[PDB]
Amino acid sequence: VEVLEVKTAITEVECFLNPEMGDPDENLRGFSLKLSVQNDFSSDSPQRKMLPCYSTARIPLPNLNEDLSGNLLMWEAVTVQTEVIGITSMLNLHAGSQKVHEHGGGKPIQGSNFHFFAVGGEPLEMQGVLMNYRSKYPDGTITPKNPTAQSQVMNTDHKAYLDKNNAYPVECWVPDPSRNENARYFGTFTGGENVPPVLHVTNTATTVLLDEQGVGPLCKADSLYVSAADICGLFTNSSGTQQWRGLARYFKIRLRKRSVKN
Amino acid sequence: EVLEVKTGVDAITEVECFLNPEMGDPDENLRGFSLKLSVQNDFSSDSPQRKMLPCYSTARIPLPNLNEGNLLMWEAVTVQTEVIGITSMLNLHAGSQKVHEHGGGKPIQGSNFHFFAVGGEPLEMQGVLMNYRSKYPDGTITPKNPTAQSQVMNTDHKAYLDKNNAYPVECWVPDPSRNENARYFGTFTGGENVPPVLHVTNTATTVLLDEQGVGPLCKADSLYVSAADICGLFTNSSGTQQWRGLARYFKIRLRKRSVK
Amino acid sequence: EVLEVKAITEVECFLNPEMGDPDENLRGFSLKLSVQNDFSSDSPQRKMLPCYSTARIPLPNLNNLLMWEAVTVQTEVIGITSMLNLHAGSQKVHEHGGGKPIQGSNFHFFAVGGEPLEMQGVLMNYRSKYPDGTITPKNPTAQSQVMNTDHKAYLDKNNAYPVECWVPDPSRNENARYFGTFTGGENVPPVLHVTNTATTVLLDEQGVGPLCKADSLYVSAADICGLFTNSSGTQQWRGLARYFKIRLRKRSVKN
Amino acid sequence: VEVLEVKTGVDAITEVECFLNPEMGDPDENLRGFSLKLSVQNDFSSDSPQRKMLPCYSTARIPLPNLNEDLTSGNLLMWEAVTVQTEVIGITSMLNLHAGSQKVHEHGGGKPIQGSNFHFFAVGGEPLEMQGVLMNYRSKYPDGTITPKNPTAQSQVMNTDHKAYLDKNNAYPVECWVPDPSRNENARYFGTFTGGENVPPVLHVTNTATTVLLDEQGVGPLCKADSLYVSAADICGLFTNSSGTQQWRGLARYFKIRLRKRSVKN
Amino acid sequence: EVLEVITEVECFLNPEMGDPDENLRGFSLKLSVQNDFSSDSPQRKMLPCYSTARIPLPNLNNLLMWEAVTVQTEVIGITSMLNLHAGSQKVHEHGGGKPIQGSNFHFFAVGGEPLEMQGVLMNYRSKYPDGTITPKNPTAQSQVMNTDHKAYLDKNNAYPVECWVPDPSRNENARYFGTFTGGENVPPVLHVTNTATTVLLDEQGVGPLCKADSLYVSAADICGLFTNSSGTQQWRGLARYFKIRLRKRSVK
Ligand SMILES: [Cl-]
Ligand SMILES: [Cl-]
Ligand SMILES: [Cl-]
Ligand SMILES: [Cl-]
Ligand SMILES: [Cl-]
């Protein structure tokens, strides 16, 4: 794709992208199944509803080319406003949660969290890395194929497109920094038992998606792809069991028309 | 729709206010606190009492009347804001659990939320529930007729923050798909031992102009301020826990703007 | 009011903390904390209550008037390394261990103004009975636990206004600059920086600094570093002095 | 490793990409990326750590295209490293709390990886220059490791004898060596150490972050003998087994380095 | 006397943590606590001290003086704390050794004369041991600000860190920077890079001027407490590297 000048035209698209934490029954939307532990890497068979997955959505756009002429037009993503939706819901310390102590309130959601988004002109490109190459992953998941011990560090065979919602477990996959030429991604992982969730909301924060040459992701087939993972931490039930809790992510993307050489 | 800043005599004004927190106020002596937290064992039977639920604060500030070809509107340019009474938490001598024998009282700490908005209309809110089956009490305005989807994103839960001491903080967030004519800022920090960290200074200003140099435009010459400042949990002698909240100060500088 | 800059001077001051000073050996400490079970009966002893520090620095009487204008301040908390003494009087972290560090709730605050600091009263417990020698909100109500606009005071006496009762008032102080950070919690680590390379500019948007009314400069502070835990598990506030170096210039104003 | 000629000519850019594997010990064929369980001796006088328990610095030398047709010219061309994009690969694999880990409490999830960590990279036109410093100069280091020679008690602070090139992968223990700030004129290095048994790992990924490698004079590392040197250490923290034993977990580091052709005096 | 306007000096300054025997260079003696302020007699080897070195500069001699323009500085050997296999308390049964952690202080100064210090004490009644220089004739005011307690950092391994701070009312001809982090479980956080430079020029563009052709470097790098198998605690410190760029300035 030879990139020419901006047309001077604009549009905004938006999306609330639901989280995919596992959803173990019809009432526990936004949560995973309780975490179970197998004593040994040798026999690790997690249930599907226990595994948070990456979220993704394809936003279709109208074709711009009256004829395909020497030059074509593509939608170009310029900026994104994004935020995690429902952060104040973790102030519900009155239902279902283990008491911090006798006569005390419920335990807050806390622990390992991951907050990730991407905007691209094509599906997010992912690289597989496993904690345990011998994990047996369940039907409905898409995980690294024919993993080896090298899969626990870096095995260049584990390449995937984030091409299915609620299928790619967050624990098996990361955005691939060796690809994603036509997407921008941003993530923070914070690990530990007692990590406090720290979440910010503001409508004043804009991420610019333009690269060094002033070019944003280009919607090559007239579609825009948004991707997310927002594991906020672990909910501790009265019983002591733990479940992931996730929140939806809002996207507002400003697009403009870009001329490219046919 | 937005034309030139109008300068001249009386083309600038400044308004200020203190917005009290709405933490629940469980009796006539415990203004600024919630009722003690109680925990029900299951999502199926979650019935919080009204006085246990901190709510969003909000007020409408009138501005000098402007005439309704271009409309004139007040444009909010800057805000100075801070939480009032942060040093009150250095009272460790009254009603608080002893950190240990011979020790002082337990500081306020734990989950906190600090939030403010300045807009030309009421703040627009999106509903999200920890537990869609929560039974909320009379006197609250909470997401109407919630479903399992209401635990993640249900687009039916749209509201204006149009009543003080009514919209529980746990049910509602600012809606990033709306608020075209407002600026909002919030930080949630969760966890049992989270330390409150609060800054005061009369030298810090937030600029409310967007990328085009336009601030919120005040419809019907009204400015809307919103806040929630849950500082954390106060731990009584017996180990019961209550929310503590503090008031928020606003000083807002405005200018006249030609429109449409 | 304010015309052109006319004529330089520097003043410096070390302002001692007022942590309660429970006896003549424990200067810089409060009396041990005691807890009363209920808000209905809360009568803190004077020596248990840290208070705001303040000094008035007189300046040459220059009298269209001329006024001293505060332009910059360099400020530093003095003695932060004294907290590395874990061999004197502190609870052992465990058997065979060293002493427990100073830690917990802290407040670091200073102000420079051309008049006394304007303060707003807010109370944890309106029914608190404060001791003789303290100045605290008069006629408090339940509304004094949030915002009660009656509670307005000038910081006009050293070692009298308890830190727990008063904050700088953001609705006043047009003629002062203030800065504070409160960090609350049982195990909060003190974090303190020193450098002689940091200057705070005191000029407002129009390039005007605080103007010294009646040729006086006012410095204010509170530096509660945390709690010292003694051998038996008692807790006391520890505070440190604050240094100020203020550059002033002469400013013309309208008569 | 991929070496891609993005542009040819005087304004030639070469992009070098590579994934550098961590060297945490690899105690068995199934625990690639982990150390051997930590064991503690009572005393400094009897400290003999096992080889597979000691994480080592990762390093590779990447050969670049020859630039000089005529070796006899008054001026020669060198590859100059101008930018690097880097990140740690597989950070989400720490969300597996279901495999082999101590429960946080009865009926709870697995304990996350946490504790002391070190995240470090370097890009240079020669091997990284290292200075030795030991916790305990009387440590007896195992065969297969390269550690400070004839250390003294002064080796626990600064002993200027302990100079080394990071010239072998999986051999220089992270605990014995740091980058030498008195040398490395032709390399850029960046590291953060965070110590404590409850330290949470905090790791960021983005394809938008670039580090500029030019010094004050606008000059990047110059690749001597057409050689680019990448080095890393990414100890994420400790994994706690069901038994309560603790092992280091490491992750691979990606590098994307942009290089230009600089004329230098022969 | 400063009128108008190159060399690089470098130093590895060793830490002075106490060094309780020939094998524990870089550590302090185990901590002991006395129950009361009235009876506080710490042993010399238990007390970390400020490090300092006088660095001779080429003689130049209306007069010319070396002016310090920039410093690069780094704490040396931070990865040594990844030894959790040697002499440390186990964090739980079968677990690894306890990391170095707790109270820390990281400080450096570059000056054209010795660092000027102000005394402040946790406990004015402490009796300090022979070989230390501590506040003379301390009073209860020594717990806050007592202007009697002025000293020059004029001796390596003599001025205990717990007794002295840099004096912000002096040091007109030096630049200093320190951070104190207090508490039992504070994690050490230490950064290395050869890309970071501190400019030493004041707002007028003048760096420290080297009197008697001498440059003074000062440090304190208490990393935290090492907890041995028995539960005893000792300070651990690391060396600090300095690389200082100097230029010639005409004075009178
Ligand atoms: Cl695969
Ligand atoms: Cl609704
Ligand atoms: Cl009053
Ligand atoms: Cl060696
Ligand atoms: Cl003295």
Author numbering:
A (entry chain EEE): 32 to 39, 43 to 102, 104 to 297
B (entry chain AAA): 33 to 100, 105 to 296
C (entry chain BBB): 33 to 38, 43 to 99, 106 to 297
D (entry chain DDD): 32 to 297
E (entry chain CCC): 33 to 37, 44 to 99, 106 to 296
In the authors' words:
BK polyomavirus (BKPyV) is an opportunistic pathogen that uses the b-series gangliosides GD1b and GT1b as entry receptors. Viruses sampled sequentially from these patients accumulated multiple mutations in the BC loop region of the VP1 protein, which is involved in the direct interaction of the virus with sialic acids. All variant VP1 pentamer structures were globally similar to the WT VP1 pentamer with a doughnut-shaped ring composed of a central pore surrounded by five VP1 monomers in 5-fold symmetry.
This suggests that mutations at position 73 on their own may not be enough to induce a clear structural change in the loop orientation, which only occurs if mutations in this position are combined with the A72V mutation at the neighboring amino acid. VQQ VLPs were able to bind all gangliosides tested except GM1, confirming the glycan array data. Hence, ganglioside binding was not sufficient for infection with VQQ variant PSV.
